[PDB]
């Protein structure tokens, strides 16, 4: 059975996600529109930038995160931002399409759109393969949410200073995830292992994005297209 | 009569403006849309940012500008950017409306929209009064264009280093404007004086904008809404 402390951790992590994820994708009409040079870059920079704001709103609601120093919070968010975005994006990924389907014709992001944002196939190949592995896991919301907070709370990040305290938080959260799968997910004998496997996947995709963003933000006609949030989260300072 | 050298200066300055100003305002569907907190700030930051790109394309076509050092070009553009924008915006200003009418309902920028971008009435009052004084001057295109290049080429800018050389360019251009009015504008006995008067106006509006932008870019939830171009042109570095 689950303890009070562990269902409370699940309760507020599910509500935080409900408060920071919109299944209708309505706010997307406020972005710069898509175009199909790097035609998709403005719309996708806006999208990522909006998502960064939602991830921050999630993290401030993970128990224990708010009490870290501001440095460690920044350090955790900069390193883990893109991964939490790849995880959250799974809710929009459809296997029938192999596209993120955030609406009708315009907000259905195919693979040819990711390239039009300046990313080569070295990112796209393991990314979609990650997205169909995550999709086949048929995660409950409690696990999707828990996995996000576990990813965010890795001490394996550059800049983290109190890796001992954040390691304690990350372990309080794996206990919840393991307990939750064991007692509330039938047929999930293998699931925790596969889920942790996916964190190693993300670190690999993270490196590949950073290599391609670094090359992008060094060409001023492209960094021109980024938002300030994006530049601040993905730069080195 | 006008000299060859002076009609050449007029010829390429009119073409430069035709190459950097779109009377249809079609590119405005690529901005972040307007909303009517500071609801209008994203759409107007995009607008200003796009306009900065057009002013740069104009300046690179003013004769003599391309041969200044890159420092003096940056120095001239940073100081004079907002003024060239206030001047170019006159083409969209209508006295029947007192709004910039860049399209239908959405791109008709009233005065209540400028405030929704975070500007107080201390900027708006002399700004529209400037816009109706410029509008009543019924300038020919040769003068509107010439006035812009004269504004851009003021040595009275912070950062300019070769104020002697750019002063020579600005004077080559006032000779063209004076000659042009004298020989090609009937009933313009007073016009050059009034036009130069308007440059003093702009310096006053420039100061008022800078005071209000400075206060805006020091609140990170608002600078968040600016584009990188805007931040780079209007910051101090």
């Amino acid at each position: 059975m689950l303890s009070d402390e562990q269902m409370q951790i699940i309760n507020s992590l599910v509500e935080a996600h409900h408060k920071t994820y919109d299944d209708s994708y309505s706010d997307f009409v406020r972005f710069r529109p898509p175009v199909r040079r790097l035609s998709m870059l403005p719309h996708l920079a806006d999208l990522v930038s909006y998502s960064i704001q939602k991830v921050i709103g999630f993290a401030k609601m993970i128990p224990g995160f708010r009490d870290l120093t501001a440095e460690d919070q920044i350090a955790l968010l900069k390193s883990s931002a893109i991964e939490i975005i790849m995880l959250r994006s799974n809710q929009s990924f459809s296997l029938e399409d192999m596209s993120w389907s955030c609406g009708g014709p315009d907000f259905k992001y195919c693979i040819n759109d990711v390239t039009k944002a300046g990313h080569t196939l070295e990112l796209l190949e393991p990314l979609v393969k990650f997205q169909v592995g995550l999709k086949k896991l048929k995660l409950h919301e409690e696990e999707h949410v828990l996995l996000m907070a576990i990813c965010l709370l890795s001490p394996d990040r550059p800049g983290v200073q109190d890796h001992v305290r954040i390691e304690a938080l990350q372990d309080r959260l794996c206990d919840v995830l393991q307990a939750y799968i064991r007692i509330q997910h039938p047929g999930g004998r293998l699931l925790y292992a596969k889920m942790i496997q996916k964190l190693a996947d993300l670190r690999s995709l993270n490196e590949e994005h950073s290599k391609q963003y670094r090359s992008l933000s060094f060409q001023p006609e492209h960094s021109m297209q980024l938002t300030p949030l994006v530049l601040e989260v993905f730069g080195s300072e | 009569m006008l000299s060859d050298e002076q009609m050449q200066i007029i010829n390429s300055l009119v073409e430069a403006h035709h190459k950097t100003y779109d009377d249809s305002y079609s590119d405005f569907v690529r901005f972040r849309p307007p909303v009517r907190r500071l609801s209008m700030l994203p759409h107007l930051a995009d607008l200003v940012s796009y306009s900065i790109q057009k002013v740069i394309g104009f300046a690179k076509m003013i004769p003599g500008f391309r041969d200044l050092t890159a420092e003096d070009q940056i120095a001239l553009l940073k100081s004079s950017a907002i003024e060239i924008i206030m001047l170019r915006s006159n083409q969209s200003f209508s006295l029947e409306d007192m709004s910039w009418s860049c399209g239908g309902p959405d791109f008709k920028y009233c005065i209540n929209d400028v405030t929704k971008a975070g500007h107080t009435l201390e900027l708006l009052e002399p700004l529209v009064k400037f816009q109706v004084g410029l509008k009543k001057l019924k300038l020919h295109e040769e003068e509107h264009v010439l006035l812009m290049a004269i504004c851009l080429l003021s040595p009275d800018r912070p950062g300019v280093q070769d104020h002697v050389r750019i002063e020579a360019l600005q004077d080559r251009l006032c000779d063209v404007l004076q000659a042009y009015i004298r020989i090609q504008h009937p009933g313009g006995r007073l016009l050059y004086a009034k036009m130069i008067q308007k440059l003093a106006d702009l310096r006053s509006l420039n100061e008022e904008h800078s005071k209000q932008y400075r206060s805006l870019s020091f609140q990170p939830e608002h600078s968040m809404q600016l584009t990188p171009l805007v931040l780079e042109v209007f910051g101090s570095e």
Binding site: Q53, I56, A70, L77 | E221
Partner: peptide, 10 residues
């Protein structure tokens, strides 16, 4: 440094 990220974190 990181003016925005500090702001968004209250």
């Amino acid at each position: 440094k990181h003016k925005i990220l500090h702001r968004l974190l209250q």
